[PDB]
Structure 1
Amino acid sequence: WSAQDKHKEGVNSHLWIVNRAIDIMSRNTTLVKQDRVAQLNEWRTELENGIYAADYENPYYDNSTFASHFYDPDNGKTYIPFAKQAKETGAKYFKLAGESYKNKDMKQAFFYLGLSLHYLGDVNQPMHAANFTNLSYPQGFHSKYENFVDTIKDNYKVTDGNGYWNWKGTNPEEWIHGAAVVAKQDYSGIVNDNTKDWFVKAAVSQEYADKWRAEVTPMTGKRLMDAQRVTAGYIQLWFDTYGDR
């Protein structure tokens, strides 16, 4: 997903997903300790810096190749042979974040948590779970798609407090892997012969530009909503693990 604005949801789907996930935790009145949301907000600047930094600097964006932002659950690889993938990377910052939290280093903690949330967010994007980059055919579709998502994301907010609590085990990799599995299953709802053909025609036809956007909307809504629920559960897991319990 997009992350073009550091502290604004406008063109930052990653921040939006995290924010909606936190909202889920807030709406939940039976399992969530609200002081957890209080901390996320207290250190929001760092959390957002972490979410944003993933796509703009090393080592996080892998020399502008973003290889660590992809993870195919079937072969466990990213799109570049031998490169680090989203599962191991998301887990990496999840742990570094927890370790800093225990050491009472809150800025360090939430910055790293932000990065981890970013990687978890990416595997919820079908293209990232299928190694479909902006260079994959049709090239350019990846970026155009994620930019489009920003114009409609607000129409798919989860409004209940039902996040996927304890969706997977205690290992963050299980959550990242699990999300990628579901995302990859929805891949054809975004990338198929139709959307490919229409996107190519969108170059010269406004009708086709609207046609591919329309076609991918239903699945986009599904992906966005699941991403919110999974992320909420992931955050809850983080606090349960390192929040002194």
Structure 2
Amino acid sequence: WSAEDKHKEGVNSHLWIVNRAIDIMSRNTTLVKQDRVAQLNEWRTELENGIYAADTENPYYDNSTFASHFYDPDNGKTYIPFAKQAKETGAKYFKLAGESYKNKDMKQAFFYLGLSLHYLGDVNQPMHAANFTNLSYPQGFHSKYENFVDTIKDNYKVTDGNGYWNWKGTNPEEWIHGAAVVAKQDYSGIVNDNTKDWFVKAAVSQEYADKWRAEVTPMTGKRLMDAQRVTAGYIQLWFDTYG
């Protein structure tokens, strides 16, 4: 997903997902300790720095190849042979964040938490879970899709307090892997012969431009909502583990 702006949701689908996940936690009055949300907000600058750093600097964005932002659950690999993937990377920062948190280094903690949440968010993007890059056929579709997502994401907010609490075990890798599995299952709802043909025709046809966008909207809605619920449960796990 996009993360074009550091502290605004406008063109930062990642921040939006996290914010909506936090809202889910706030809406839950039965199992969530609201002081957790208070801490996330207290150290929001650092949290957001982390979410934004993933796509903008080393080592997080792997020299602009973003290799660590992909993870295919069936073979456990990213799109570049031998490169680190999103499961191990997201878990890495989940733990670093936790250790810092326990050592009372809050800025370090939430900065790393932000990074981890970013990686978890990415595996929820079907293309990231299927190693479909902006270079994959049809080339350019990946970027155009994520930009389009920002224009409609606000129409898919989860409005209840039902995050996926204890969705997977205590291992963050299981959560990242699990989210990727579901995302890959939904891949064909975004990338298929129809969307590929229409995207290509969009080059010289406004009709087809609106066509593929409409076509990928329903599944995009599903992915955004799933991403919010999973992220909410992941954050809850983090606090349960290190708090």
- TM class by shorter-chain length? over 0.9
User: What per-residue deviation string (whole Å, max 9, x for no partner) do you get for residues 85-135 of structure 1?
Assistant: 000000000000000000000000000000000000000000000000000
Following superposition, the deviation at residue 46 of structure 1 comes to 0.3
User: What per-residue deviation string (whole Å, max 9, x for no partner) do you get for residues 166-211 of structure 1?
Assistant: 0000000000000000000000000000000000110110000000
Corresponding residue number in structure 2 for 1:109: 109
1:14 counterpart = 2:14: yes
* Separation in 1, partners of 2:29, 2:233: 14
Corresponding residue number in structure 1 for 2:209: 209
Q: Which consecutive aligned stretches of 4+ in structure 1 deviate over 4 angstroms post-superposition?
A: none
* Separation in 1, partners of 2:36, 2:104: 15
User: What per-residue deviation string (whole Å, max 9, x for no partner) do you get for residues 13-32 of structure 1?
Assistant: 00000000000000000000
Q: Please give the secondary structure, in 2, of the residue aligned with 1:150.
A: helix
* Separation in 2, partners of 1:199, 1:3: 23
* Separation in 1, partners of 2:135, 2:54: 20
* Separation in 2, partners of 1:140, 1:42: 38
Following superposition, the deviation at residue 226 of structure 1 comes to 0.2
In the alignment of these two chains, the number of paired residues is 243
1:86 counterpart = 2:123: no
Q: Please give the secondary structure, in 2, of the residue aligned with 1:6.
A: coil
- Within 5 Å, give how 1:1-245 maps onto structure 2: 1-243=1-243
User: What per-residue deviation string (whole Å, max 9, x for no partner) do you get for residues 3-60 of structure 1?
Assistant: 0000000000000000000000000000000000000000000000000000000000
* Separation in 1, partners of 2:108, 2:203: 44
* Separation in 2, partners of 1:238, 1:204: 48
Identity %, equivalent residues: 99
Following superposition, the deviation at residue 82 of structure 1 comes to 0.2
Following superposition, the deviation at residue 140 of structure 1 comes to 0.4
TM-score w.r.t. length of structure 2: 1.00
Following superposition, the deviation at residue 153 of structure 1 comes to 0.2
* Separation in 2, partners of 1:51, 1:171: 21
- Any unmatched runs of 5+ in structure 2? none
Following superposition, the deviation at residue 217 of structure 1 comes to 0.1
Q: Please give the secondary structure, in 1, of the residue aligned with 2:154.
A: helix
Q: Please give the secondary structure, in 1, of the residue aligned with 2:204.
A: coil
* Separation in 1, partners of 2:159, 2:178: 23
What RMSD, in angstroms, separates the aligned Cα atoms of the two structures? 0.2
Q: Please give the secondary structure, in 2, of the residue aligned with 1:203.
A: helix
* Separation in 2, partners of 1:210, 1:52: 30
- Any unmatched runs of 5+ in structure 1? none
* Separation in 1, partners of 2:79, 2:17: 24
User: What per-residue deviation string (whole Å, max 9, x for no partner) do you get for residues 68-95 of structure 1?
Assistant: 0000000000000000000000000000
Q: Please give the secondary structure, in 2, of the residue aligned with 1:181.
A: helix
* Separation in 2, partners of 1:206, 1:83: 39
